[PDB]
Subunit: 116 residues, 4 copies
């Protein structure tokens, strides 16, 4: 997969299921254009956002809708969302995994980048 | 001091010094308007961003310019910046510390919200 | 898998490959008895440590040999190892994933626990 | 103050107050001998563990009793405790801050090592 998003819940020790994720790409006029979106599965994973052909060079933003996730579990969390902003594919195609671990007042995020 | 930002470096085991930090407040037209900014001190801290009178309820974004920090250290990083987006909420007196721990391909962030 | 260990490198944005992992189980005399060991694969994963039958109730320690990992990459890190100590299977068999994200002066660890 | 421990709570967005912390120093027979201990303050901090004269080079372990902390909050946790194991190294003057951010199924820890 060229782009995969994985979200975990540090309170429950589980994948974070049904988390909305929106991806944007910076356009030539410097605005954030919608690129792809989806929801995490029962494994906390979101696959199928894009294809190698579509996922050209650019600056991308992955917005993870953490507030809605916590609210539905009865928690009023600190953050509106978790955002991950990065340049992709500027030295040719890569595969990106964006992972996030969520707590009500914190999050950690990392990237795993591999060359296919 | 109702808002403080603290930035640490997980590669060097040190405060992240001279990191640019920009704070924005969401306007009624849903755009981000500049609110305060500065550079972290030798302790990785940025104080004096705002006052109690000015820091009213609303949605705020703290951008930390991590890419320029890593570039200055000669280390290739993943993210363009780290972003922390949250709502300020008057529920009694409040002080907010936004902390971030930086690595080249990762960051962790937390909020410590206390009442003096 | 009843027990899986996954290790990532926050400096390189990659799995942490060839990391030694030692698992211990607390014995009746309160000493740490060797239980299983192995090394992470090219995907940063270590599978096959134990079986559902062997992995009885108990207190377990997963020791990840982070210092050796960093030293081989030219970094003199802070920690000797990362240790994860937990009670397992005390409400019946579960599947455990122990994940760790490594930096030279930091680590983050989480657990994902699922009921088969 | 050559050694300070700071503990934060990612569920409540607060310092982790009244957490027991035990420090050990590895003896020549390779056992862990008690060195210092205390409970975190209302700021999540534990100062006064040791002195410059006493804190000689060696291998130290900081155990943070996270399970009892979560139990007191009525939250089921994963870990028995969080452990931080490191070597103290005289390379000019040094102060060590060991910080930990706690969630029920996760923890993050970093070291900030500075020269005053
Ligand atoms: O530097 S301080 O010890 O004052 C601190 F505020 F506690 C802190 F270390 F920065 C921190 F807030 F704990 C912290 F940096 F956020 C931290 F939580 F400890 C951390 F471990 F670094 C971290 F969790 F990774 C985070 F910074 F949140 F990313
Ligand atoms: O490899 S997977 O993406 O399936 C994963 F195990 F979930 C993971 F990526 F390793 C992960 F656990 F999510 C993780 F990336 F390590 C993570 F939890 F998100 C993490 F952010 F790296 C982390 F929180 F720091 C962890 F180190 F796992 F605690
Ligand atoms: Na290029
Ligand atoms: Na039982």
């Amino acid at each position: 997969c060229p782009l995969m998003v994985k979200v975990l819940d540090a309170v429950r020790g589980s994948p974070a299921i049904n988390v909305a994720v929106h991806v944007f790409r910076k356009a030539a006029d410097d605005t954030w254009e919608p690129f792809a979106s989806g929801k995490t599965s029962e494994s906390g994973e979101l696959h199928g956002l894009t294809t190698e052909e579509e996922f050209v060079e650019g600056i991308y933003k992955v917005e993870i809708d953490t507030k809605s996730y916590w609210k539905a579990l009865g928690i009023s969390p600190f953050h509106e969302h978790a955002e991950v902003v990065f340049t992709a594919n500027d030295s040719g195609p890569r595969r990106y995994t964006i992972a996030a671990l969520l707590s009500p007042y914190s999050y950690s995020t990392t990237a795993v980048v591999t060359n296919p």
